[PDB]
Amino acid sequence: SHMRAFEDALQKLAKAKGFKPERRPLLEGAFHFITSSEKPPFLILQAPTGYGKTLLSYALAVHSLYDAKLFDRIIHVLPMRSIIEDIQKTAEEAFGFLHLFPLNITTADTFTWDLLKLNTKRRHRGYDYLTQASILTSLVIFDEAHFLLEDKSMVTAFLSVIEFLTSQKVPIVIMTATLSEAHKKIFKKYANKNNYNFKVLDPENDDPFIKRELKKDIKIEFNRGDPLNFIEPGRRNAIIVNSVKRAVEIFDRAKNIWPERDRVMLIHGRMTSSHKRDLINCLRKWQKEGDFLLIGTQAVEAGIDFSVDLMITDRAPINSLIQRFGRVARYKNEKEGEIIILEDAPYGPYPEDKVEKTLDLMKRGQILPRIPETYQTIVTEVHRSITKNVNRELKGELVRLMKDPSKRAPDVLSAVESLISIMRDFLIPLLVEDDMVLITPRKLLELYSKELVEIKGFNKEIKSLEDAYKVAKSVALGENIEIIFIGNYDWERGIP
Numbered sequence: 001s002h003m004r005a006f007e008d009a010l011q012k013l014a015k016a017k018g019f020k021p022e023r024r025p026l027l028e029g030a031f032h033f034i035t036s037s038e039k040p041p042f043l044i045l046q047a048p049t050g051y052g053k054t055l056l057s058y059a060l061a062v063h064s065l066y067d068a069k070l071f072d073r074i075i076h077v078l079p080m081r082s083i084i085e086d087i088q089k090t091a092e093e094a095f096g097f098l099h100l101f102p103l104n105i106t107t108a109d110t111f112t113w114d115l116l117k118l119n120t121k122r123r124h125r126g127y128d129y130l131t132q133a134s135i136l137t138s139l140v141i142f143d144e145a146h147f148l149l150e151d152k153s154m155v156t157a158f159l160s161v162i163e164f165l166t167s168q169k170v171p172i173v174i175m176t177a178t179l180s181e182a183h184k185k186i187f188k189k190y191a192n193k194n195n196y197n198f199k200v201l202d203p204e205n206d207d208p209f210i211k212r213e214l215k216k217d218i219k220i221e222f223n224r225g226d227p228l229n230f231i232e233p234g235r236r237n238a239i240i241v242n243s244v245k246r247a248v249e250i251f252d253r254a255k256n257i258w259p260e261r262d263r264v265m266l267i268h269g270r271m272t273s274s275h276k277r278d279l280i281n282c283l284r285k286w287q288k289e290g291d292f293l294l295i296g297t298q299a300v301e302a303g304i305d306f307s308v309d310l311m312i313t314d315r316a317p318i319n320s321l322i323q324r325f326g327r328v329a330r331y332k333n334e335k336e337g338e339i340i341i342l343e344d345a346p347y348g349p350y351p352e353d354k355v356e357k358t359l360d361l362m363k364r365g366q367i368l369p370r371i372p373e374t375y376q377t378i379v380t381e382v383h384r385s386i387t388k389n390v391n392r393e394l395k396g397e398l399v400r401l402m403k404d405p406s407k408r409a410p411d412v413l414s415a416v417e418s419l420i421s422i423m424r425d426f427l428i429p430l431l432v433e434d435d436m437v438l439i440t441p442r443k444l445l446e447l448y449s450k451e452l453v454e455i456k457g458f459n460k461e462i463k464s465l466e467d468a469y470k471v472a473k474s475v476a477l478g479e480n481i482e483i484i485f486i487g488n489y490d491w492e493r494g495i496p
């Protein structure tokens with residue numbers, strides 16, 4: 001065999017999470033492929049939601065302190081909106097992890113700023129890594145995070161970071177339940193262009209996991225109106241919506257509606273890390289004890305491990321919905337669940353094209369979850385096209401800039417300004433008192449007009465979105481400014 005790192009992680013994790021193992025072949029196959037493998041490996045692990053794919057990351061990480069010929073640490077990338085506190089809290093509790101950590105958990109926009117040599121410091125708080133060069137000595141695992149290609153505002157950048165990563169022959173794993181083949185092709189391209197050892201592992205017809213979940217029946221229904229029309233006390237409930245503001249106002253009423261106020265909970269991303277971890281701890285207590293209602297946004301979807309009897313979610317494109325569906329009957333002796341998609345809900349950040357097409361195709365071909373046969377074709381038809389909006393001459397300059405030591409943040413910033421910028425999505429540190437909260441340039445403006453922000457060390461005192469985009473400019477440059485919250489942070493609602 002020759003993998004006792006893998007089983008070391010499987011035991012230490014299965015202790016902490018209190019489950020008894022099952023062998024999950026694709027995980028083993030993926031671990032071996034990585035540790036074996038002549039060349040730089042480029043794995044696409046295409047496994048259903050709930051398989052246990054985060055194990056591979058844990059395993060590989062407890063394989064970095066023994067063998068370091070291929071990589072010296074693991075960088076685990078979650079999606080942009082995502083909450084990373086849950087994986088951090090089992091890396092810390094289950095395995096005991098500027099310093100060198102075996103397992104670093106980041107978010108996909110942070111990741112690309114880092115590779116663009118931009119200042120991401122207070123995001124990494126000591127600090128786990130702070131340099132492009134540490135990333136180049138890593139194995140980089142995207143955990144459902146490649147879906148930055150479906151964001152118009154980033155695709156050109158995240159593609160340059162895929163191009164550049166592959167150019168430096170960094171080993172790469174791509175974890176996803178929902179792999180389009182438009183996606184598969186641009187990955188395979190860059191993995192072939194740089195002579196990786198490319199490989200796709202999807203489950204095959206005998207998989208002990210798919211059959212565990214074929215036995216389950218989890219009904220999915222469509223509906224309209226207020227999400228609290230559909231709650232069911234006495235079961236584990238979860239309402240997942242597409243914006244934090246939507247989530248907050250549902251929670252403002254759910255606190256009074258739900259029988260036990262103790263068991264109503266709001267999670268989104270506009271909260272402090274301290275707060276997030278507090279909630280993660282309450283949430284793991286809540287799963288073994290009885291019933292509760294959880295209000296959340298997409299932030300809960302790639303990286304948080306919970307399981308809920310009834311789920312009510314907004315309509316969203318198929319990758320997001322599969323993600324969300326995965327959290328309903330997730331563990332093994334849970335065989336019945338219900339899902340309610342709200343076809344009238346607002347799109348939020350999502351493109352309307354893809355959301356509607358998603359809902360048209362599901363309604364034709366009723367899909368059973370965690371069982372790719374049912375959703376694979378929806379995925380490939382929805383999640384296509386990316387090449388349309390790639391500013392491919394900038395994508396070229398970005399890959400030359402990262403490759404060049406002589407070029408730093410100032411040069412990459414004024415490069416993109418020619419071709420205010422992509423800076424729409426450069427989240428900046430709002431400091432609430434000792435903790436912080438990432439917020440978009442635009443909610444920085446909003447919070448400024450309401451006179452809840454004070455900026456030490458910058459003096460144009462924000463109006464005009466372009467003023468905000470300049471705060472983001474200087475934060476990315478490492479300017480000595482502080483963006484401070486003056487209001488009193490709401491310890492259940494997060495930030496406005």
Ligand SMILES: Nc1ncnc2c1ncn2[C@@H]1O[C@H](COP(=O)(O)OP(=O)(O)OP(=O)(O)O)[C@@H](O)[C@H]1O
Pocket residue numbers: 010017019020021022023024047048049050051052053054055177301302303304305323326327331
């Ligand atoms: N070897 C294993 N055997 C049985 N169960 C496992 C194993 N590894 C992990 N799990 C289970 O899977 C759960 C974690 O799965 P996890 O959510 O990491 O899968 P995932 O592929 O990341 O799913 P998602 O796509 O929803 O993030 C744990 O609660 C644990 O019970």
Ligand SMILES: [Mg+2]
Pocket residue numbers: 054143302303304
């Ligand atoms: Mg995960």
